[PDB]
Amino acid sequence: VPWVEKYRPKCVDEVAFQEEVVAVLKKSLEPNLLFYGPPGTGKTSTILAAARELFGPELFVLELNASDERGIQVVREKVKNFAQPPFKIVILDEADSMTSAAQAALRRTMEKESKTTRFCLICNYVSRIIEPLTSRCSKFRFKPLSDKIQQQRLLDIAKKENVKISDEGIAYLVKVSEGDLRKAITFLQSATRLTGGKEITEKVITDIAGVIPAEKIDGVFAACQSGSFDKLEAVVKDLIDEGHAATQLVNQLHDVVVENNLSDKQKSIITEKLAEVDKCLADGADEHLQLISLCATVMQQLSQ
Amino acid sequence: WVDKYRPCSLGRLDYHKEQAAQLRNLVQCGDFPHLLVYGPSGAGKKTRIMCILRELYGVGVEKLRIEHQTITTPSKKKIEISTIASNYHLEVNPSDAGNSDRVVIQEMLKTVAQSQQLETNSQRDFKVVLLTEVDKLTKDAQHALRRTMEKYMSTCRLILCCNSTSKVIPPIRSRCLAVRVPAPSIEDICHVLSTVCKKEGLNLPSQLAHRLAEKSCRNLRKALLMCEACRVQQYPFTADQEIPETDWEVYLRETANAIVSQQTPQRLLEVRGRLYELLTHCIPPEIIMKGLLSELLHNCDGQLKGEVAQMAAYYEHRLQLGSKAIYHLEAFVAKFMALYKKFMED
Amino acid sequence: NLPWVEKYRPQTLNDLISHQDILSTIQKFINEDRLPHLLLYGPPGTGKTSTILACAKQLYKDKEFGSMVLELNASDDIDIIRGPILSFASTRTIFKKGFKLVILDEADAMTQDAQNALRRVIEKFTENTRFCLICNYLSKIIPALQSRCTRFRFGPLTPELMVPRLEHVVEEEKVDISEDGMKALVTLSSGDMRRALNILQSTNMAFGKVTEETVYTCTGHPLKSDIANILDWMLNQDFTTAYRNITELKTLKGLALHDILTEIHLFVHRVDFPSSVRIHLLTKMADIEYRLSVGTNEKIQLSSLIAAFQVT
Amino acid sequence: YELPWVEKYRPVKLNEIVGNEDTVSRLEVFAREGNVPNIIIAGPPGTGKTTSILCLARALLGPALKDAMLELNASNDRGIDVVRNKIKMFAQQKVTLPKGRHKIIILDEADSMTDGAQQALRRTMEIYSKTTRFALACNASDKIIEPIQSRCAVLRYTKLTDAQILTRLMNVIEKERVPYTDDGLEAIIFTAQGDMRQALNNLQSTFSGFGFINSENVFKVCDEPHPLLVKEMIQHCVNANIDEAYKILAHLWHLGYSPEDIIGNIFRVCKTFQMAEYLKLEFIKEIGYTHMKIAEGVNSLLQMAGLLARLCQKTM
Amino acid sequence: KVENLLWVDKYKPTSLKTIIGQQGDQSCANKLLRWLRNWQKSSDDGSSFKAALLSGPPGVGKTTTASLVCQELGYSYVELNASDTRSKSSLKAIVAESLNNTSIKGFYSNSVSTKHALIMDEVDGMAGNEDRGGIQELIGLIKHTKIPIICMCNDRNHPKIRSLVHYCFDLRFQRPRVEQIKGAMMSIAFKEGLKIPPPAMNEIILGANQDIRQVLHNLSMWCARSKALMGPFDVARKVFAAGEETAHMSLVDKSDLFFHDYSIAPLFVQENYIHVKPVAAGGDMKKHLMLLSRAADSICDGDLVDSQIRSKQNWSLLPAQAIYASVLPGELMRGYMTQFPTFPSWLGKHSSTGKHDRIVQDLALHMSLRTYSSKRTVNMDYLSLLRDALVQPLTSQGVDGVQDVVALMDTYYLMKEDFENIMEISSWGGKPSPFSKPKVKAAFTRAY
Ligand SMILES: Nc1ncnc2c1ncn2[C@@H]1O[C@H](COP(=O)(O)OP(=O)(O)OP(O)(O)=S)[C@@H](O)[C@H]1O
Ligand SMILES: Nc1ncnc2c1ncn2[C@@H]1O[C@H](COP(=O)(O)OP(=O)(O)OP(O)(O)=S)[C@@H](O)[C@H]1O
Ligand SMILES: Nc1ncnc2c1ncn2[C@@H]1O[C@H](COP(=O)(O)OP(=O)(O)OP(O)(O)=S)[C@@H](O)[C@H]1O
Ligand SMILES: Nc1ncnc2c1ncn2[C@@H]1O[C@H](COP(=O)(O)OP(=O)(O)OP(O)(O)=S)[C@@H](O)[C@H]1O
Ligand SMILES: Nc1ncnc2c1ncn2[C@@H]1O[C@H](COP(=O)(O)OP(=O)(O)O)[C@@H](O)[C@H]1O
Ligand SMILES: [Mg+2]
Ligand SMILES: [Mg+2]
Ligand SMILES: [Mg+2]
Ligand SMILES: [Mg+2]
């Protein structure tokens, strides 16, 4: 079994650092539940622990995601089919990615079935869910664990599984997947298969996390800082030939532009271009051309 | 001989040897995960995939066949796809079904999952469903892929062979081990060329192999083809060979030079004819745009290159939204003519 | 227990509110046996499925209501037309004399071929079965089909009309409603009595008292002060410290960028700008919304929004 | 039970169809000589396709209309089995008609037949053309497979000009003696959009609900965004006055008009408006862009406000 | 006297020398005639098949060709249309016992002639649930037959038919050239007493896409309009004019110009907008190029609206498209058309792209040893190097062309059809293939 589930909480008041959610989940016998929070903060783990506490190990809850490709009708149809411990629990993941018209229909389905099934909407934004669904639900914020806790639990995992990783390795593991304990644990697991347990250096983490090294970002800014278009072509060609996706380059380039000492006008222009390039890439545009364009804008902004 | 010297075992790879040892350790440990292998074209993604399969199952993964399955759209427009299959895996490209890529994924995953339930005992308890060219799947299809990847996780593993994962939904990137296959260095290409020619017993010199590498632009398949094609014409290998390039490279280059020469509508019509001759041979419009833009930038001024780069990026973006690529290609050309003439004249 | 959206349903035809013209015309149709096929369209929760049900209960009896009224939802399924509908419209009911009634709820989820088939069915049997279609987007209905039947737009309820019914509900029940809790309920409802009564009941049942704060916390609607804070960070701060502040607030409470952007638009129109600056803010915010509609990173779109406000 | 005006005043001969003088002229020629080909009448709704085919079939056959005509609507079973059995046995059936007359198989809503049915209908059309003629009607003339269009004359129909709808409306008013006024007739012609059956339905519904016909009353039964408000909003956008155009826009949004409806009316009003020409085109460009973005699904008020901002900043 | 017959039936090809499409040495009808005449030797290089597959565009003469061919040689055929149920059970219960049987037309004729054949027309109509399992039983019948089966299709590039072409002599009807149909229809219109200018005839033949049945029906309707006393090219020419449409046209009229044939008008405009000389740009090429770029931008906007309308059947964006693709370019290019509103010519290019696509895909699937890419230029460069590989031995030495052609053809699992495909596939700019640049090719086809 994967480590993302082998080390899940088995009880409600057991390890979940969030206190005001584990207290109410005892009285959960406001008909429905609504969890929201950043990804990988024990959203599904907590309700699964609550369901294994309430129902029991053999009494086994339909979990499906509301972001299906097959429309919304099949979702509510499956809920109806599952409808027929005086109730059953259905879990809706990514419930914020439902359009308002699809939440209206899920509202009708969940309010006509409000006698035998309890719902749990798991999302990352409570504002995306419309006011009927939230008004029928009881909200619960899930805040990520503190950085030190993250490293603590990761060391606990690495000692329970005998994975020889440096402490700076753990620091970089939690830094490379920011505040995402699920992602950090999955990386720790899938980065020890990649070595056979001999040694897990930060290069393996940087490769698995898909993070382009900060050297290449500094090279991109060194080229666009002052130089002809040939340097931009060269650095972009080298960055594409390395395999690094353009999404990661745009992400890290934005992260560097925002929290540096560029002017407000320059930051504004560069970030507008970053957003446009990000949409262009999300629309299937070609990475080389979009990166060339973005670098041309950044160059005409910095060089001036 | 491109298919005659490609290695077949992970210990036989020519470059990225640390990654090779890592992949060998991966297939050696239990619970082989879903792999997402990516990297620029012609870097060795398929070679590494075939080596992973040779390490995963027996050598019986080479005795493959070619199955022709038919899918049915949400209407009577029936489509036929080509699945290269072996006794332990299945390699389908679920993108030839232009916008019906959501049903092929579901059905193929289902069929492989049910065939693995028929006494799969050779060495593993799962099959491999290699989907090539994944970054061009529609979002409604990548969502189905995400769903049916866990729905049948226990019986079939997926290896997504894309490049530049930028257009892969994070729901998938979060469920696949990301294997990144960079393009081999110039020296790596030179060494593999020298090795191939020495196994061939040829006299590949040290100044021609480097020209082949620099012209191939980190593409190993292009370099091997260029080496094979400079032999079919002039066996003795000297320092200044006229190493050939493919037909469409030349065509696209002369088309760009023609755009640069004249700036008249009578020239724009001939450029439209050239773009039609290029599209008809089924070369992607993104390749046309990048190859045209390069040779164009070679013939502009440093002050104009910014506008031309942004124009190419803009037009290419829009082309990925419409249906008739010739419209946007000709628009880009017309715009570049109207800009370049106004720049040169003034 | 029993929801208030059902306990206070208008049982008769006059207990409907805010549609006196439409209600009077339908009542005149009933009195003169001139009832045509009806197409009731408008935003949710405005009183369509209650108007036609009151009209039915006024037209038939309660025992004829199973054999002369076909209440059919159109979101379950071209076969539904030539199936139960054509077999209901063409046949008489044995001992009852008079037309039948077919009520197609959600009549805009029908494919266009189904609407062609249904239009021919309607055109054929138009003197023993009256159709009453019900939809939210009249634009989704084929112009052919809509041509057949008289159309009634059930727009939203203005707050003057709907406040007396809420006051009657409050007095009949025991709800200690503040003088602005009614206002923050009317505002959040946005003119559909169903959502107003639902929000009111759920908040009164969860917290025990309704006010301008309790309803805003029960529905998770972004408070006005928070959006004022965000606009102040954008308008009177450095770029980076605004990015930091806005991101911290956006992750503190559950807040996306769509809702931030909507409320910030309303504020851009509220506060005073030189009227050549809000043309820029409006253009850029309407581009950021389109960019977010395609599934992009919100960390680069939020920064784009701050860039838009940094024209000042 | 009195039947509606859409039927009480249905033209019973092709001299009374006001739609498309050229195509109806062709069809009168065919009703005179008598050897019709398989015809596919295609065009927008409400323009007189079913009526034209029915009047043509009547004028051709005459009293043998009960024996020589087979009509199959969209509400009838028209699968491959019906096409292979009923339509074929009717084509083979013997009916003795005058020299140049043929049996007629009217397949109304021909775009609703599945491909298998049309494939099964091809050879029935081709073989028995010596005694059987087909007359299909459709709106989307591309839903009919190509081999069926290859053996039919594709007669195109177009929307009606405002003068033709006005003539027929006056012919009906004269017979019904309904009190009217010019603004009411202009309102009906604006709400019709060419559909001659929509216009008659609106006329009858307005007259039966209220009697007198005036624009104030026409927009009480149709009830779409009053074109005067949209004209005023576009006027404010011409003077680069965003704060006064967003006023009208938010007013329209308050009454719950769906943004598709608001854009439809804004387009239809900005097309026949009184601006300059280049400025009108620059406006229609942006309105089309925003219509695309709304049909795609981004239908919030922010997009309408952005459209207004662009329209304003086109005129500096 | 009134005529109870269409033109499509009055002027049908009663003989074999009257098929307008093909009257040549080796054409679809003579190839079939020679395959049928000596079919007995089976039980062109098609004498090894037991069935023919006439395929091609509609209205070109497939049905007439097969009937007249089977009728000239004295054959007697049993036609099975798409209006006859052909499911597996029905097919193997109707036509199974007739394939290996003698026809009674072979004994009792009203002269007497054997050689009974079967004609399976509209074989791509054997789809749906009604004809469940038709194509499978049909190939199972073709495999064990004793009379010539003549199958007719309509698009050889069909999923169900792709499993059938492997058993059928593959004929392919071409759209007849405009001059042939022009001569024929002019003779017909002369027989009928109808005078039409040859330009209008070329317009009619092109608008109907060289579909002889459609041009005959259009001539019937033309004569109908003549007795009663606006086409695509005409409206396509009316959008780029100046001098007469100043007060005659408004935005409603210019937008309506699109609505005449809204399915083809944007293509006509995108094709013919480049041959205009903007009156606004009085010879100043710097402004003429700018007008061209602006018109191209507008046409791409029209393409965006088109691709949006196609996906979801949202016919409310038709006016927006009419603004982007037909009215705007009009105002931008408002000069004077030079020559003529030529045909859009995009449909033919799309069809040829689909052909080249499937050709390359098939050739690449056979090269599936350990390498494959569905249809990319990856294979276009493997196949360009394969073409230069193959032609080299024979260019330099006649004696090694056979040895190498076979060695490669069998190393990558290729055939003679694959050779022909790989040769005239990489000819850029109408450049002759490096295989026609003599005596060895004759023995090359015979010895392979
Ligand atoms: N507060 C917490 N208490 C206990 N375990 C935690 C906590 N936060 C994270 N975890 C661990 O992290 C893992 C992931 O938590 P999940 O509930 O799967 O996160 P998530 O909400 O599913 O994120 P998604 O599904 O990608 S949106 C579990 O295996 C837990 O062991
Ligand atoms: N005009 C009204 N008068 C009185 N109660 C009303 C009125 N409109 C809505 N309601 C109340 O709101 C509830 C829902 O109204 P409905 O008629 O069901 O709305 P609706 O038009 O059916 O919305 P849909 O079906 O989702 S489009 C009813 O149970 C009533 O209690
Ligand atoms: N051109 C016309 N001249 C006169 N009356 C017309 C005309 N078109 C429509 N009508 C009237 O509208 C009624 C219905 O028109 P139809 O012939 O049904 O139009 P249609 O082409 O069938 O529209 P469809 O089938 O919905 S696409 C007729 O009974 C006439 O009264
Ligand atoms: N080559 C031709 N020469 C003369 N007349 C032709 C020719 N092709 C078609 N026709 C005419 O068109 C009619 C129909 O042609 P067919 O051969 O039946 O078409 P088809 O090839 O069967 O097309 P399908 O079956 O729809 S794919 C005949 O009756 C002729 O009048
Ligand atoms: N390790 C290697 N040693 C020798 N040749 C290789 C190696 N890796 C790749 N190649 C060459 O590249 C060719 C194909 O590249 P491929 O593996 O398909 O990468 P991609 O999938 O990115 O095109 C092989 O036929 C071989 O010629
Ligand atoms: Mg979860
Ligand atoms: Mg309702
Ligand atoms: Mg009709
Ligand atoms: Mg035929």
Tab-separated table of C-alpha atoms in Angstrom, chain B residues 1-17 20 43-55 59 61-62 188 192-193 195-196 199 220-221 224, chain E residues 369-371:
chain	number	residue	atom	x	y	z
B	1	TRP	CA	19.988	1.397	-39.144
B	2	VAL	CA	18.159	3.632	-36.676
B	3	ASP	CA	16.272	0.579	-35.425
B	4	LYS	CA	19.381	-1.603	-35.766
B	5	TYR	CA	21.557	-0.187	-32.976
B	6	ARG	CA	19.049	1.086	-30.435
B	7	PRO	CA	19.842	-0.743	-27.177
B	8	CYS	CA	17.466	-3.215	-25.585
B	9	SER	CA	18.627	-3.451	-21.948
B	10	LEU	CA	18.928	-0.701	-19.363
B	11	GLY	CA	22.550	-1.668	-18.836
B	12	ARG	CA	23.223	-1.060	-22.520
B	13	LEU	CA	22.145	2.587	-22.697
B	14	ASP	CA	24.520	5.145	-24.175
B	15	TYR	CA	23.695	8.253	-22.114
B	16	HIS	CA	21.892	9.227	-18.912
B	17	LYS	CA	23.414	6.263	-17.137
B	20	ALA	CA	19.214	4.210	-16.239
B	43	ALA	CA	16.022	12.114	-26.784
B	44	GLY	CA	15.295	8.449	-26.104
B	45	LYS	CA	11.920	8.244	-24.395
B	46	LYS	CA	10.843	5.227	-26.440
B	47	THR	CA	14.219	3.541	-26.045
B	48	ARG	CA	14.024	3.927	-22.275
B	49	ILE	CA	10.416	2.723	-22.291
B	50	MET	CA	11.294	-0.399	-24.273
B	51	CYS	CA	14.225	-1.037	-21.943
B	52	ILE	CA	11.915	-0.657	-18.939
B	53	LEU	CA	9.589	-3.217	-20.491
B	54	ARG	CA	12.463	-5.613	-21.195
B	55	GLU	CA	13.452	-5.320	-17.538
B	59	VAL	CA	12.080	-10.738	-23.746
B	61	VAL	CA	7.819	-8.059	-24.979
B	62	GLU	CA	9.466	-7.720	-28.397
B	188	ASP	CA	26.915	12.229	-26.216
B	192	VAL	CA	27.027	7.420	-30.088
B	193	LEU	CA	27.691	8.341	-33.722
B	195	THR	CA	30.148	3.996	-31.756
B	196	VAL	CA	27.571	3.273	-34.453
B	199	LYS	CA	30.259	-1.105	-35.098
B	220	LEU	CA	19.574	11.919	-31.743
B	221	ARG	CA	17.264	10.439	-34.363
B	224	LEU	CA	21.546	9.156	-36.881
E	369	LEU	CA	9.620	-3.503	-35.549
E	370	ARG	CA	10.569	-1.524	-32.437
E	371	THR	CA	9.915	2.045	-33.639
